[PDB]
Amino acid sequence: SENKLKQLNLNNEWTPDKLRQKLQTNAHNRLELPLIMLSGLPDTVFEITELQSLKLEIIKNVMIPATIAQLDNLQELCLHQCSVKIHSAALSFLKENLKVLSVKFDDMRELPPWMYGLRNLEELYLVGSLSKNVTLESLRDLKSLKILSIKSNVSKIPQAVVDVSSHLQKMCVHNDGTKLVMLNNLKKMTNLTELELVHCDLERIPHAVFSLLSLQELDLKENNLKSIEEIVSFQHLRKLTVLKLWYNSIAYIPEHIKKLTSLERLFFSHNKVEVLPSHLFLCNKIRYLDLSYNDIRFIPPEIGVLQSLQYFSITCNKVESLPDELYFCKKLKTLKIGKNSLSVLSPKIGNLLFLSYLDIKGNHFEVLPPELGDCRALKRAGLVVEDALFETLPSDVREQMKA
């Protein structure tokens, strides 16, 4: 008797107007309705047929009724610290329709056991503790799973993921620093194209990565990497274009990196690099190069050979001079000089006709070159500088950049 009146007072309060007031567009380009502290699920929720995602936060003892079948445009479900039970027809609807799922559990209490039966699920995001052996059930009935992201404290890639190896394409594990010591199952992730082993305390590039011949992107963030001479084995991965070694302790970029033929995006920010060698710029197909938060002092002239370079960042280094050959990278779209030790800015920056973002705040400039007006895509909103330095620009250069 009390439960009926409870839901009556939830449905009375949450009318479709006040519910649609909370409608927004989420990070996955979907129309989402966020519920944050309710006593349950209002039945009126199933009248908002236009919503594409349903986000539940801190709602304990939730039951999804069969009226969930009314949400004809339902592709995503989000659970933050929620204990959710489903109806039979509700689970059938979610099995045939739910495509993206994101669950955050403080305890195993909030990880729904029905999630393992959603075959039409394409993306799965878990943020919670799953550990010896992972307490993840076999992803056996996720027949269409493509992206898996596990945020945990896990020491081994669970065998549960080996049951999705035939069609899984992107796997992300961002552990809390717990060392991933058993990497054997990663060898069975054949059809993987993007891999993220972040903050796993690996300490060396793992051998298993060299088994993913179809791998294109790689993220090894926050793993205390000091020696990366295993880059040699990456020439066995002939389709690798994105290689992220950022947030490590690397001080020496070996010559073997020049043999990474298909390299285009190189993430080397937040390392211990003091000298960037000549051969680093023999990877002529590089578009993205972030070397920020290092001890770089000189930029080599050979960077001029990177004719396809569009993104370059050396913020928070010890750079004292920039080579003029840098302004041969005529496709430069973003230049982040940032907090260095530059005394003068070359007029040849006018050659970068595509430059749209420049950050030179925190340097040793005395006057800015007028040829900054030749960068037709660069605006003051996209130009980071000391306002006193921006005053050194010619008057109409100033106005043309502001309007």
Numbering used by the authors: 396 to 526, 531 to 802
Report text from the authors:
We thus expressed full-length LRRC8C and its isolated LRRD (LRRC8CLRRD) and purified both constructs for further characterization. As for the LRRD of the A subunit, LRRC8CLRRD is a monomeric protein in solution. Its structure determined by X-ray crystallography at 3.1 Å shows features similar to those of the A domain, with both horseshoe-shaped proteins superimposing with a root-mean-square deviation (r.m.s.d.) of 1.4 Å.
Volume-regulated anion channels (VRACs) participate in the cellular response to osmotic swelling. VRACs are composed of proteins belonging to the conserved LRRC8 family, whose expression is restricted to chordates.
